[PDB]
Amino acid sequence: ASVYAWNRKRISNCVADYSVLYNSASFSTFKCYGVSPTKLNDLCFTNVYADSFVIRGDEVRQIAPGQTGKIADYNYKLPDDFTGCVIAWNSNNLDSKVGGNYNYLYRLFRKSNLKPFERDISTEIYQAGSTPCNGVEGFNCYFPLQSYGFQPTNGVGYQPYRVVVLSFELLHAPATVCGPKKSTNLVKNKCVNFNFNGLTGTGVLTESNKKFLPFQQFGRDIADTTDAVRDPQTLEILDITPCSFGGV
Amino acid sequence: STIEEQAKTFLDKFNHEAEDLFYQSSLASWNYNTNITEENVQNMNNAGDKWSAFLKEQSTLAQMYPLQEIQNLTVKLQLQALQQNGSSVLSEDKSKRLNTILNTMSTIYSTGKVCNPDNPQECLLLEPGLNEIMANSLDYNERLWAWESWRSEVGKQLRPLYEEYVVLKNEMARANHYEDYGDYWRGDYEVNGVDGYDYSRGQLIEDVEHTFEEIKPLYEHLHAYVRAKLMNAYPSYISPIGCLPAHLLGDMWGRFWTNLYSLTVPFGQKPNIDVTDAMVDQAWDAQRIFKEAEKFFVSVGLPNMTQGFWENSMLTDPGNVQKAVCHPTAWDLGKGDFRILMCTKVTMDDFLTAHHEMGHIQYDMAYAAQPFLLRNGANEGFHEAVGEIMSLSAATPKHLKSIGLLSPDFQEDNETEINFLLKQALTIVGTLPFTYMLEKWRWMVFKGEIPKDQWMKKWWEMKREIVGVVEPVPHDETYCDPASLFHVSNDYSFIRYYTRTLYQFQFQEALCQAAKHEGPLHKCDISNSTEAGQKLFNMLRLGKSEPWTLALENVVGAKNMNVRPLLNYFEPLFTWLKDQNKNSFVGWSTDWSPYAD
Ligand SMILES: *[C@@H]1O[C@H](CO)[C@@H](O[C@@H]2O[C@H](CO)[C@@H](O)[C@H](O)[C@H]2NC(C)=O)[C@H](O)[C@H]1NC(C)=O
């Protein structure tokens, strides 16, 4: 969609794999504000707002925290305390066509600057002077939107550029967006330090004979000591025995 | 509220609108040129009319926004360029009369035909008939007959048309607070409001006069040697002391003396600089030409060029289903659209012409970030110079050897260098006095100082004193030979060629200095030189926002016009001409004429 009508998507209750986009190596711009891309991968966020639109290359700098401009102030404004990142890539092969891809628009004219994280889709003719527009364009009255001009021959500052802004959120609401929790291989019959979804126990894991219930996750003993855990991956039960120890 | 902010917002929005509409108009022109069809011509005409109407409306709407209280230099320059209404400064009737006169003059020049007296039914036009005859046939009688017929069938018709066109141009120039149309044209080079770079219209005139004065000995020696070779070819047609014939200059108006290189070659046995044999043996084509040119672009530091041009623009003649213009054109369409339209063949000449055209195109992307009103050169002699410096550098034997066109076993002796220098002088140096005199003549013709009843009597006089060329047939005021030229017959400034030549010589010298070149300037090649490309792009990207004097200072360090690069380039040729002309008369005599014995 147009930048003044930026597509807002709510990302939550899902695993957000930032590694694939961090290492796809095909995007012109990847700017992370407030947190490095690697560290946010192993971090949990309550929500993500994904604002996707198309702007020009020169306007790419406009889409950044603490920036002012036509796109920054009349189409999409970012708060200074930005948490997510911004990913932009050339769309000349897609969003640029022979004759001019004029479908896209941007709010060139507006009566006031946009509030951060606000979208303006007003189509009323902006009144430059004191002369009323009377519902039509003319003197002191112009359309608030200018059509984007995209052609395959355009330069870096004039080619189409799809921009996706991933703002991260973590607040009193329960955290939803987390990266892929890395899982290592499985070992057995060896005193190892394990962690199954937060158990963080240490011992020797052996093949179990007891049968859990499908809703159940891990067993327990009379002394309230963990003694059997079901694998979060392939469904099987393992008895955890304490590491061999004694006196000498 | 205030004029400043409202004018700036209007400037931005109508700059976007004008960029879009100019792109549409140039796209219609490109469609017409690639395929000459009735729908294509109609699209061309409609797009041109819409663009002109919207440009006039935007110019008027900017006119009601005063520039008195606007202090932004770029905004002021853009709005002043818009305010240059030109022919519309007069009444609607006067503008329509001027348009009709210009159209009639252009149509007469283009459709002008010459018919042999023996065969009245057989008639030939100027192009390609007259040009081919005058560049190939060496017969004095046939060349003189073609000269007289072309300058009579068109000159007599165009004389009233040219006179009324000049009168109208003076009228609008006076309505534009200019002394004459020459002043209006020179106002493009004028710089105002810039500290340390202001340029006046008379400054250009005096600089051109001084440059021609310091070039005079070299041109005199070159003309003397060409004349001597001409008696060597025409013993009984040209006096050793008298001036050269007008029709024996190679072309119709004497613009190019390259056609005389066959008869004025320093050595007709030594081979010339040409790699077309190896070029066609290497299975090269137009695609190979363009790829090698792009490789040369990226070799000098210039960035890789967009694939949109490759997937949009045409290279060779698109068969016979549709007709494409073979004239080399570099279309800076707009909205970042850049295309090239030429009939590219497997030849060295087409190689150099294509190199020139992608030089134009790269200069077009150079000022892409500038606004539409600033999306052009500072003057009319920059883009052609930018293309020609690259074309000449690629024409050097070093570039051909690097790209495989010339074998490394090739020997570079003084004979080939002298032949190439003389060929360039006939192509380049020969046209400088002619361009200078023609532009000056048009300047006082617009000024009206020279009485009309002896205008021709003035022209041939300056054909003798300046060019050193005497007409073979005397022409009265009925003849309008200067208007027989395409530029005069189509409202084109002619000083652009001389200015572009001097600019390109300066640019070549600057690029050679940046490339740490050692030796003759003609063998200098900017290939594989990042510093030269960067220095060129320092002025390429500036566009027309900065004064042209600022660009010249950035490139070569000379604020005003310079001829030192020309002297450095042609010093071997100057020495050779001085050595060869020691046994022949130097200069020319105005009194002698072919029609007087
Ligand atoms: C996690 O995903 C893997 C996908 O491979 C699932 O493991 C597969 O389970 C089948 C069951 O027969 C085996 O044949 C494959 O060899 C397993 N692949 C592996 C271990 O890489 C596993 O079931 C999933 N865990 C769940 C759903 O809890």
Short mmCIF file of N, CA and C in Angstrom, two decimals, chain A residues 98-100 102 106 108-109 126 128 139-140 142 146 149 151-154 158, chain B residues 6 9 12-13 16 20 23-24 61 306 308-309 311-312 335-339:
data_model
loop_
_atom_site.label_atom_id
_atom_site.label_comp_id
_atom_site.label_asym_id
_atom_site.label_seq_id
_atom_site.Cartn_x
_atom_site.Cartn_y
_atom_site.Cartn_z
N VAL A 98 7.48 0.07 -16.77
CA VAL A 98 7.65 0.99 -17.88
C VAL A 98 6.41 1.87 -18.00
N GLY A 99 6.63 3.17 -18.17
CA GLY A 99 5.55 4.13 -18.19
C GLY A 99 5.29 4.83 -16.87
N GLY A 100 5.86 4.33 -15.78
CA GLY A 100 5.69 4.95 -14.48
C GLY A 100 4.66 4.25 -13.61
N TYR A 102 2.54 4.65 -11.19
CA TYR A 102 1.88 5.76 -10.52
C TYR A 102 0.80 5.31 -9.55
N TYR A 106 2.01 9.23 -2.05
CA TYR A 106 2.59 9.70 -0.80
C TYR A 106 2.00 11.05 -0.44
N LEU A 108 2.18 14.29 0.02
CA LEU A 108 3.06 15.44 -0.19
C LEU A 108 2.56 16.65 0.59
N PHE A 109 1.27 16.95 0.48
CA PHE A 109 0.67 18.12 1.11
C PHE A 109 -0.13 17.70 2.33
N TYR A 126 -5.98 20.03 0.16
CA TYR A 126 -5.31 20.94 1.08
C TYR A 126 -5.44 22.37 0.57
N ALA A 128 -4.04 25.90 0.47
CA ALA A 128 -2.79 26.62 0.71
C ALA A 128 -3.05 28.02 1.25
N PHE A 139 -6.52 27.36 -7.51
CA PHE A 139 -5.63 28.30 -6.84
C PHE A 139 -5.71 28.11 -5.33
N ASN A 140 -4.55 28.05 -4.69
CA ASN A 140 -4.42 27.87 -3.24
C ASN A 140 -5.08 26.58 -2.76
N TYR A 142 -4.63 22.21 -3.46
CA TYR A 142 -3.93 21.15 -4.16
C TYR A 142 -4.19 19.81 -3.48
N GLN A 146 0.67 12.99 -3.73
CA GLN A 146 1.38 12.98 -5.00
C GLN A 146 1.69 11.55 -5.39
N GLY A 149 6.46 8.02 -8.69
CA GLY A 149 6.92 7.74 -10.03
C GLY A 149 8.04 6.71 -10.04
N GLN A 151 10.10 3.75 -12.33
CA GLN A 151 10.46 3.18 -13.62
C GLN A 151 11.69 2.30 -13.42
N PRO A 152 11.88 1.30 -14.29
CA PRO A 152 13.06 0.43 -14.14
C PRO A 152 14.38 1.16 -14.32
N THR A 153 14.38 2.32 -14.96
CA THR A 153 15.59 3.08 -15.22
C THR A 153 15.97 4.02 -14.08
N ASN A 154 15.20 4.06 -13.00
CA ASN A 154 15.40 5.04 -11.95
C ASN A 154 16.73 4.81 -11.22
N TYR A 158 15.65 7.37 -6.56
CA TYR A 158 14.35 7.46 -7.21
C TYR A 158 13.72 6.10 -7.50
N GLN B 6 5.15 29.23 0.80
CA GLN B 6 4.18 28.85 -0.22
C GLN B 6 4.85 28.64 -1.57
N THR B 9 6.81 25.27 -1.44
CA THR B 9 5.93 24.11 -1.56
C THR B 9 5.40 23.97 -2.98
N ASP B 12 8.22 22.62 -5.18
CA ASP B 12 8.40 21.18 -5.07
C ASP B 12 7.31 20.43 -5.83
N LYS B 13 6.05 20.80 -5.60
CA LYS B 13 4.96 20.04 -6.20
C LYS B 13 4.95 20.18 -7.72
N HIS B 16 7.76 18.16 -9.30
CA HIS B 16 7.36 16.77 -9.49
C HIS B 16 6.44 16.63 -10.70
N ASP B 20 7.25 14.64 -14.24
CA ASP B 20 6.39 13.58 -14.76
C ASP B 20 5.94 13.89 -16.19
N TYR B 23 8.78 13.67 -18.67
CA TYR B 23 9.05 12.26 -18.93
C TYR B 23 8.03 11.69 -19.91
N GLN B 24 6.75 12.03 -19.73
CA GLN B 24 5.73 11.55 -20.66
C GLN B 24 5.96 12.07 -22.07
N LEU B 61 2.28 30.89 -12.99
CA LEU B 61 1.97 30.78 -11.57
C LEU B 61 3.20 31.08 -10.71
N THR B 306 22.36 1.48 -15.17
CA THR B 306 21.13 0.78 -14.83
C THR B 306 20.72 -0.22 -15.91
N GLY B 308 17.65 -0.90 -16.60
CA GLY B 308 16.47 -0.41 -17.29
C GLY B 308 16.79 0.11 -18.68
N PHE B 309 17.93 0.79 -18.83
CA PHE B 309 18.36 1.22 -20.15
C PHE B 309 18.58 0.03 -21.07
N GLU B 311 17.19 -2.94 -20.92
CA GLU B 311 15.94 -3.63 -21.24
C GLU B 311 14.90 -2.72 -21.87
N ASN B 312 15.19 -1.43 -22.05
CA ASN B 312 14.27 -0.50 -22.71
C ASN B 312 14.80 0.06 -24.02
N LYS B 335 12.08 11.63 -14.89
CA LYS B 335 11.77 10.69 -13.81
C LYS B 335 12.82 9.58 -13.74
N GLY B 336 14.07 9.96 -13.97
CA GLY B 336 15.15 8.98 -14.01
C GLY B 336 15.04 8.01 -15.17
N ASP B 337 14.67 8.49 -16.35
CA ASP B 337 14.62 7.68 -17.56
C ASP B 337 15.69 8.16 -18.53
N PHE B 338 16.52 7.23 -18.99
CA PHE B 338 17.64 7.55 -19.86
C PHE B 338 17.74 6.49 -20.94
N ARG B 339 17.71 6.93 -22.20
CA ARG B 339 17.67 6.00 -23.33
C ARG B 339 18.57 6.51 -24.44
#
